[PDB]
Amino acid sequence: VGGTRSAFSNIQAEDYDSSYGPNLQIFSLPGGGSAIGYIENGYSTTYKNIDFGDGATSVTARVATQNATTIQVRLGSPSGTLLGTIYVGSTGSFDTYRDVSATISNTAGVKDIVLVFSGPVNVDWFVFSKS
Numbered sequence: 001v002g003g004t005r006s007a008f009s010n011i012q013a014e015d016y017d018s019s020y021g022p023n024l025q026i027f028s029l030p031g032g033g034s035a036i037g038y039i040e041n042g043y044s045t046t047y048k049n050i051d052f053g054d055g056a057t058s059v060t061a062r063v064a065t066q067n068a069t070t071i072q073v074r075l076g077s078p079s080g081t082l083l084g085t086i087y088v089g090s091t092g093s094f095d096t097y098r099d100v101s102a103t104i105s106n107t108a109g110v111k112d113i114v115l116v117f118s119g120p121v122n123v124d125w126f127v128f129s130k131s
């Protein structure tokens, strides 16, 4: 119960262990579950102890936004190694969620992962895979 979280099953974005974001909020979604939002440039959320097993090279995030932005995936801290960058084009509405993917450098073992935001976006969940 509450064991190590797999990188290969959805990680809920609201399930962060630490963050920088004075106005960042968790809120309920109409279709069930929750998202993080009220995000601004330089905000971040950190997810401890994610088990990448013997490696992942892709990330997918379920996101909503009205203006193009990016989400950096970093190792350990907001200033740690940049694993990859998710390019989030508009989904037309902060309430319309779509899946966007990106390549990451091969990440293996149990790792702390940080999402670093460049601008407004709502995030439901994210997950990793081997390309």
Ligand SMILES: OC[C@H]1O[C@@H](O[C@H]2[C@H](O)[C@@H](O)[C@H](O)O[C@@H]2CO)[C@H](O)[C@@H](O)[C@@H]1O
Pocket (backbone or CB within 6 Å): 036, 037, 038, 039, 094, 095, 120, 121, 122
């Ligand atoms: O409308 C919900 C949506 O708001 C987003 O922030 C808006 C904010 O509502 C608006 O009052 C302000 O002027 O602009 C910001 C930035 O676009 C927020 O980022 C979303 O999380 C939220 O879903």
Ligand SMILES: [Ca+2]
Pocket (backbone or CB within 6 Å): 012, 013, 014, 033, 034, 035, 123, 124, 125
């Ligand atoms: Ca969620």
